[PDB]
Amino acid sequence: MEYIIKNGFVYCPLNGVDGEKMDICVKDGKIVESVSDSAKVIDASGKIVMPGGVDPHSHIAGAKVNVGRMYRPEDSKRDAEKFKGGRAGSGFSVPSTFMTGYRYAQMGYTTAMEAAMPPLLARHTHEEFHDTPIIDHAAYPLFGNNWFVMEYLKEGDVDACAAYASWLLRATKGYTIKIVNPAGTEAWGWGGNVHGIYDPAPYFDITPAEIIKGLAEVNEKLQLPHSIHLHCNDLGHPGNYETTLASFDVPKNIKPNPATGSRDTVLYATHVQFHSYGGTTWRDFVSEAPKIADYVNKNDHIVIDVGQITLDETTTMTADGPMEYDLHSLNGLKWANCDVELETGSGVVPFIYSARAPVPAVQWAIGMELFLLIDNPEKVCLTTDSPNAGPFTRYPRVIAWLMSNKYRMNLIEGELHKWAQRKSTVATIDREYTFSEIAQITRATSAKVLGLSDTKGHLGVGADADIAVYDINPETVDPSAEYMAIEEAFSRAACVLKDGEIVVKDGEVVASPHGRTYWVDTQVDESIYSEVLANVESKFKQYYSVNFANYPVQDDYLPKSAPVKGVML
């Protein structure tokens, strides 16, 4: 079909367009230079036009997500819906799959990544994707506690690890090398953990630092579109900021080498809010986001996302098994766990981030400090580690917070515990994000660092026709004073197109197409590959609980396979 999007204020940071009024032309799911005079018109007068949002880190599809759904029926009773055109759903903090896709779409997001897939459970993730409307998607298989990875990397055999990874990304139909609490989750298999990046796991005797370094080497040896995706050790502990900065340095001198896309960074650090803590106990707990932000400013090898607290009752779900048990120990709330043989672990705990409480107050401040003290938006992405710090439905409120120091001070001076002022510097920061910087952290940075900026994250010719129109007029409305108009406008887009077809109009979902599944296609020396596959099959016979032939994901689970090539021949 043909569409012309007329007279909108276009924000496209990758093509350097900053609020220029400009028409966008669309033809057969692509953005093109011109269309016929018979093209149907979408009036964007007095409205903002952006590329479809691109979420680089969310928990939306898989086993740990569905445990959060299944064991929180009270969360569904809180927010249950049936829009009569579409499928029923429920779940405030962990929504069902159909509800999930609808709501990304309603807020103008068209691509969202599942950030933690246990390889043995990969069929589950892909089955939930099929029932997730609209959004294009991908899944990050986990590597930081993998038995093959730990065995190969200790022997210094990085090529064999790269052959294993090549096999695993193809077998799970995965997209990035995700590292969560490296070595620590394997230590949790016996009820323990690792402390700092030089503390080895039981038996395997390899450090987090060596796991991070080896997998970064593997990542660029396989020329993957995205970098290693790192969830640090010592998450959520007072004083952990030093473990974080030490982790950030480990892969710095590894040079990026994507075969697809424009990524120029070797490290992606996720939900860094949780890794920016000072003090030594919760009683002297203090923000260290300035030192963290200062590291990012001075370094050119790192991209981060924040993991912003939204001050809600939400659900936490992570592959960081030992950390969730500690969290259950503190708040006493229901606790789920799943250790996956030879591969990973996981935990699920509800958490109430009450604005009244001192610790969540400081946690909210830390994320704001990270957003506002980092100078270059090209180094940061907007995330809530959904749902860990809050549901993704609250990205507009995060946007509103960043665009308005009025909104922030209203919350700081009333409702937020005093500790937000005493134990951080948020109150002294009056910086406000512009509409251009918002599009950068919600579209461009993520699209670029994921290796998709050829087709995603921009409104230029050649891009996919993933487009969001927000009913807000930047010439006429003041984002600082009218922060509730910013929040409401980014929640319910006036028009959303997904591959050239209208899928949302005035906040209403009007179509339910299936999105593509991006995965990574890599080729490795056939000789090393065979040897590794012989070794892999031997342990399956001995130590796995399934048969090797039944393990990889069959093609029936990817109706819309969209391979992306890394290293070839």
Partner 1 sequence: SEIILTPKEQPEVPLEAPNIKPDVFAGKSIEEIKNIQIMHGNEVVKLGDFFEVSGEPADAPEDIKIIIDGDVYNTKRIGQEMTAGEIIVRGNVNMYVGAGMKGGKITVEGNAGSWAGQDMRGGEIEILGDAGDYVGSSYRGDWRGMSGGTITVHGNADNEIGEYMNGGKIIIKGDVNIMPGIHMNNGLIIIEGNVVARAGGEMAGGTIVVKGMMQEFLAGFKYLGVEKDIEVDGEELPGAFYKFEGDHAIKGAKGIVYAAVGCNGHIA
Partner 2 sequence: AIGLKAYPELCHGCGNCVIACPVNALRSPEVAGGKGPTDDVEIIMIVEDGVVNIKNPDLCGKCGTCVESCPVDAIRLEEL
Partner 3 sequence: MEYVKNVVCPFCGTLCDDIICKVEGNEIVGTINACRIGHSKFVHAEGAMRYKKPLIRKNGEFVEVSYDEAIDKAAKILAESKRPLMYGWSCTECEAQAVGVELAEEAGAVIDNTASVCHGPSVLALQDVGYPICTFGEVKNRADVVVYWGCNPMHAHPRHMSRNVFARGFFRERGRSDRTLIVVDPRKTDSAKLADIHLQLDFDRDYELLDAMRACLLGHEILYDEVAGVPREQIEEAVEVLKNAQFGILFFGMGITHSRGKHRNIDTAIMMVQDLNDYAKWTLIPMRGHYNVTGFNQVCTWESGYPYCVDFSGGEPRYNPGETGANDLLQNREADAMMVIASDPGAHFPQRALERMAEIPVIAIEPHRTPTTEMADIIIPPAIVGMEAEGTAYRMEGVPIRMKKVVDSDLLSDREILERLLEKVREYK
Choose which of 57, 72, 237, 271 interacts with partner 1 (CB under 8 A). Answer: 72
φ and ψ of 391, to 5 deg? -70, 150
Three-state DSSP state, 150? helix
Choose from partner 2, ligand MFN, Zn ion, none: what does 274 bind? Cβ within 5-8 Å by kind: ligand MFN
What letters, b where the CB count within 10 A reaches 16 and e where it falls short, cover 193-232?
A: bbeebebbbeebebbbbbbbbbbbbbbbbbbbbbbbbbbb
Binding of Zn ion at residue 263 (CB under 5 A)? no
Choose from partner 1, Na ion, Zn ion, none: what does 231 bind? Cβ within 5-8 Å by kind: Zn ion
Q: CA geometry: angle at 252 spanning 157 and 280, to 5°?
A: 105
Choose which of 52, 60, 75, 384 interacts with partner 1 (CB under 8 A). Answer: 75
**Nearest distance from C-beta of residue 359 to partner 3, angstroms:** 22
Residue among 495, 460, 493 nearest 20 (CA):
460
Q: Please state, in angstroms and rounded to a whole number, the distance separating the CA atoms of residues 359 and 351.
A: 12
Q: Please state, in angstroms and rounded to a whole number, the distance separating the CA atoms of residues 118 and 125.
A: 9
Residue among 264, 258, 290 nearest 277 (CA):
290
Choose from partner 3, Zn ion, ligand MFN, none: what does 115 bind? Cβ within 5-8 Å by kind: Zn ion
Print the binding letters for residues 88-117 with Zn ion: x by CB under 5 A, - otherwise.
---------------------------x--
Please list, in sequence order, all residues whose beta carbon lies within 8 angstroms of the beta carbon of residue 502, skipping any fewer than 6 positions away: 3, 42, 495, 496, 510, 511
**Nearest distance from C-beta of residue 547 to partner 3, angstroms:** 5
Q: Please state, in angstroms and rounded to a whole number, the distance separating the CA atoms of residues 49 and 31.
A: 13
Half-sphere exposure of 376 (CA within 13 A, CB side): 14
Choose which of 37, 541, 555, 569 interacts with partner 2 (CB under 8 A). Answer: 541
Choose from partner 3, K ion, partner 1, none: what does 255 bind? Cβ within 5-8 Å by kind: none
Q: Please state, in angstroms and rounded to a whole number, the distance separating the CA atoms of residues 551 and 144.
A: 20
Beta pairing partners, 313: 352
- Contact predicate 443/54, CB 8 Å: yes
Binding of Zn ion at residue 385 (CB under 5 A)? yes
Binding of partner 1 at residue 356 (CB under 8 A)? no
Binding of K ion at residue 443 (CB under 5 A)? no
Binding of Na ion at residue 51 (CB under 5 A)? no
Q: Please state, in angstroms and rounded to a whole number, the distance separating the CA atoms of residues 272 and 275.
A: 5
**What does each C-alpha distance from 149 to 177, 189, 388 come to in angstroms?**
11, 16, 27
Choose which of 58, 66, 76, 393 interacts with K ion (CB under 5 A). Answer: 76
Print the binding letters for residues 213-252 with partner 1: x by CB under 8 A, - otherwise.
----------------------------------------
Choose which of 12, 359, 370, 468 interacts with ligand MFN (CB under 6 A). Answer: 359
Q: Which residue is nearest to Na ion (CB)?
A: 144
**Nearest distance from C-beta of residue 392 to K ion, angstroms:** 16
Piece of 91-99, 205-213, 305-313, 503-511 that binds K ion (CB under 5 A): 91-99
Residue 342 CA to chain centroid, in angstroms?
A: 25
Print the binding letters for residues 216-255 with Zn ion: x by CB under 5 A, - otherwise.
---------------x------------------------
**Nearest distance from C-beta of residue 115 to ligand MFN, angstroms:** 9
Choose from partner 1, Zn ion, K ion, none: what does 77 bind? Cβ within 5-8 Å by kind: partner 1
Residue among 230, 221, 227 nearest 163 (CA):
221
Binding of partner 1 at residue 71 (CB under 8 A)? yes
311 sits in the region (left: phi over 0; alpha: psi -120 to 50; else beta) called left
**Nearest distance from C-beta of residue 86 to partner 3, angstroms:** 10
Choose which of 27, 57, 59, 69 interacts with K ion (CB under 5 A). Answer: 69
In the chain, the N- to C-terminal Cα span, in Å, equals: 38
Choose which of 142, 323, 398, 438 interacts with Na ion (CB under 5 A). Answer: 142
Binding of K ion at residue 100 (CB under 5 A)? no
Print the binding letters for residues 29-68 with K ion: x by CB under 5 A, - otherwise.
----------------------------------------
Please list, in sequence order, all residues whose beta carbon lies within 8 angstroms of the beta carbon of residue 273, skipping any fewer than 6 positions away: 289, 306, 307, 308, 309, 363, 366, 367, 370, 389
User: Residues in the site for partner 2, rule: CB under 8 A?
Assistant: 538, 541-543, 547
Residues that bind Na ion (CB under 5 A): 142, 144-145, 180
Interacting residues with partner 1 (CB under 8 A): 71-75, 77, 332-334
